[PDB]
């Protein structure tokens, strides 16, 4: 859908990460991110809203 117009920053609740440059982040907002991602996830089924 994008072609190669811009470079790509996925990240997924399953701790699966897909960066077209590993260079632009390193391991430590990498890690901030799934924190956060698995962190809402896990509180949202606490409460039943998942």
Same mark, same amino acid.
């Given at each position: 859908?994008?072609?190669?117009?811009? %470079?790509?920053?996925?990240?997924?609740?399953?701790?699966?990460?897909? @960066?077209?440059? =590993?260079? /632009? &982040?390193?391991? %430590?907002?990498?890690?901030?991110?799934?924190?956060?991602?698995?962190? @809402?996830?896990? =509180?949202? /089924? &606490?409460?039943?809203?998942?």
């Amino acid at each position: 859908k994008l072609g190669n117009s811009m %470079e790509l920053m996925i990240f997924s609740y399953n701790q699966d990460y897909s @960066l077209s440059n =590993e260079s /632009s &982040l390193d391991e %430590e907002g990498k890690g901030r991110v799934l924190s956060r991602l698995t962190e @809402l996830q896990a =509180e949202l /089924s &606490l409460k039943n809203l998942w």
